[model samples]
Target: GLMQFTLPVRLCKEIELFHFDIGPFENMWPGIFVYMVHRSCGTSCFELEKLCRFIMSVKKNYRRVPYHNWKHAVTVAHCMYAILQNNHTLFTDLERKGLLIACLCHDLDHRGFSNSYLQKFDHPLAALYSTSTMEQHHFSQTVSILQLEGHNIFSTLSSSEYEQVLEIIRKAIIATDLALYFGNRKQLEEMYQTGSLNLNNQSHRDRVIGLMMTACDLCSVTKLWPVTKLTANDIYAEFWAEGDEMKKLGIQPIPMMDRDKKDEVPQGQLGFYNAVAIPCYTTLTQILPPTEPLLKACRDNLSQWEKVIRGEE
Candidate 1:
């Protein structure tokens, strides 16, 4: 039953390399899930079929927002897969499975609003988790989906193995919060500076796993120019919609969220690349040299953003 829905030949061929321009590639979502699961955690044919149903359910739960939709989720998963492929020897089997799953579920059920927006408006999710609001909800959703009947892809695992995988998944998912990035980045930077970062050390490796989650979360910065621009517009469209809604409630939106300041998009991207995205890739590449392409592509995107800032685009 599962073989019919497994990754198609065309997709397997197309996805051999990472390219962000794979628009409407939603059909490949299940295949990516299957590949990651099969590679990281071996599964039987019966289990694979069950996993496909679960993947579809997960996909259906995603909202149809301008961005952060099922498409974005799959893209993030693809980025994780790409990274794992390049740095195959850097992570353990558990870390590999956890990171891929975390990327897929990181933005589950996103309401097209930032955590600040949710908290300011007293949104229920904000009150539920005092910190890392969206990330907490996303992790909860991941667990919920897994708990569904026949959705537990790790059912084949021993009790201890299951617990360890879930633990890593929780850590990886929560690490996607941009609010946590500065702290994680600082820690990783210090480790790199002091030459104390050892991949063999559990603690040091966990921190790198967290950083990898963030890297995959913002993978758009490392994509080609066309995909990068399209993704930016989609993201800002979502941001502007949130701002427009806040206006109806008589609340002021932040600069990035404000629709009136849409022109700031270029400058905002430039700042993000310089402050967040570039540094993220640079640090990751420093720790894992195989990831240098990510840093290189980010620099290319930075130059493009600069052109846009100068009204040359």
Candidate 2:
């Protein structure tokens, strides 16, 4: 039997304002994702109801963690939804659906541990995949969830179309790993620099999907100051906990993860913005001019971090 639930009235009202509101919770995310899917893909009511149930199951599968929990998943999905709305015609129907689903599942079943931690500890997941370990796990988890009875939201698609969406989901999820970002950034920048970034080009579109996933994964950096700070604290708390576990096991933790270096959050964030976030948003806006607001907000947040680093905040 399907576990039945209702979309709360508050969440119904908030879904319309998801672009500007930061008020969604774990229970509310499924409704928002379902709404986006219907708006973008025009799924049938029966399929929509099944998807809501599937999403709730997905939410339950997400472990309660400091940063990578259901709230973060919803937020990332929300960011992708907002981006899709802003650039509605920029992506093909398939591409839009793939990106949205990928964002929702990218960090599924995360253990609040970085890949480095997984590698250093020889975690079983690391042994399974020589590269992009966590991402592979996330994609696998998504597939498993979809396999669960009544959870195959894409069952409505044609056989070939279903295969295509799965492939896109796999690639988009793997691309979220920051280790792949530098290569993706360089490739995208070259395409834009040569004025060869064509939506009609399959390779070009795939690269853009990768960049878009990166942008949404780090969307907190482009949010208002208060939200940015709140998200940062949540992420660092998770980092520090990982550091504590590493210490208990007689391994040295990275600087950012070390609890004693908590005061260095601003400086670490500054470097991240300069080296990663700013360049990512800058490249995105170059290709999608309407996305310039993302770049602007990121720059503004960067300035705030700079002031905090200088004790001026």
Candidate 3:
């Protein structure tokens, strides 16, 4: 059964603010925008409104709980939005829209645990789908739900527009499940050397989408200090909880999380940052100069992590 969460009103407002500012929501809901200046990305005002309405509907229908919650979605969306803002000129408007759509819907039906867990339990979704990457399955279900008789988001779009949206959505969601972290940065560096950014070039869309999604997936380092730490705490708790479940099933627990203690968030987060976040973001910033601000934010976050690791509070 799907679990649900009652989102705090403040969080909902924050999401709305961010979505209106940087997300494609405004363009997705055209009828709502009366002033041209409100359209930040020059997207069809109507389409933007439609997209926003679609997201709202998804929120109303889906319940966020233990794992794939509204917080996760918002965090991912914020990171994706930040990356796009920092490097807006690098891609075309259509590509930007696609990225926004993909990021928002990537974990649409997430079940709070890795897809592996679902399959192990013989969950209906796993049995019904029988596919690899349970994460991908969650995403596919979202798309399927949207296509059901009365839930289609693209139903009103022209066939060509709908097809374009579908293509971008599929590629973006799949790319998230692929190992594109280092490869994405490498490709961009090579592209940079070429000195010719073909924003409108169809071939580059996939790469850009992947890079942006991966960046967002790893964007915790860029958040404000308190927010970053709070998010880290939640992530650590989830990790340890999952690890505990693994042990209960006689499987090895994933390391870097304390499988027995809820108060061990500080320790797990510290270890994760030192061993993973620092090195990753350090290298990422060097590769993408546009992400320097985020790198600085990351460095600040790492410092906090270090203090926590040392029991400095």
Ranking 2 against 3 by TM-score, winner: 2
lDDT string, candidate 1, 160-240, tens digits: 979998989888888899899889989999999999888888778778988888998898888889988888889999989
Candidate 2, residue 110: Cα displacement in angstroms equals: 0.4
Candidate 1: list runs displaced more than 4 Å: 1-14, 39-46
Candidate number that wins on TM-score, 1 or 2 = 1
Question: Ranking by TM-score, best first?
Answer: 1, 2, 3
Model 3, which residues run further than 4 Å from truth? 1-49, 119-132, 148-158, 178-204, 261-271, 274-288
lDDT of 3 by residue, 192-236 (tens): 567653556676656666666665666765677776766666666
TM-score of each: 0.92, 0.92, 0.72
Name the 10 consecutive residues with the lowest summed lDDT in model 3. 29-38
lDDT of 2 by residue, 158-253 (tens): 898789989999999999999999999999999899988788987788888899889889988877798898889889989999999899889888
Provide the lDDT at 190 for model 3. 73
**lDDT by candidate, in order shown:** 0.82, 0.82, 0.58
Model 1: colliding residue pairs: none
